[PDB]
Amino acid sequence: NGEIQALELPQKAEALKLFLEETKATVAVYLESLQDTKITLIINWLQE
Amino acid sequence: IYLRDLKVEDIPLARITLPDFRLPEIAIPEFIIPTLNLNDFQVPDLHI
Structure with missing residues (x-):
C-alpha cells in the first residue's frame, strides 16, 4: 500500500482516465462534424 | 430524387x-486470512 501510494498510481490512473475521456469527446465531435446526419448535407456535398 | x-x-x-x-x-x-485457534478445544495431557 505504501509503495502504491508512493508512486501516485491512483492519480496517474485518474489523469489517464480524464485524458482518454477528453480524446473520446474530441473524436466524437470530429465524427459528428464529418458524418452527415441529413440528406441535404450530402446533396450539398455534391455542390463541393 | x-x-x-x-x-x-x-x-x-x-x-x-x-x-x-x-x-x-x-x-x-486487502483480504487477510482469519486467525484460527484450536488449542482451546483440545489440551495435550501426554508428556513427550
Whole structure:
C-alpha cells in the first residue's frame, strides 16, 4: 500500500482516465462534424 | 430524387458525445486470512 501510494498510481490512473475521456469527446465531435446526419448535407456535398 | 432514409440518425454516437472507456482507480483488494485457534478445544495431557 505504501509503495502504491508512493508512486501516485491512483492519480496517474485518474489523469489517464480524464485524458482518454477528453480524446473520446474530441473524436466524437470530429465524427459528428464529418458524418452527415441529413440528406441535404450530402446533396450539398455534391455542390463541393 | 435522392433517397430519404438513413441509419446514421438512429445512432446516438453520431448525435451526442459519449465519454466512455473509463479507468477505475488503482487500488488493491486487502483480504487477510482469519486467525484460527484450536488449542482451546483440545489440551495435550501426554508428556513427550
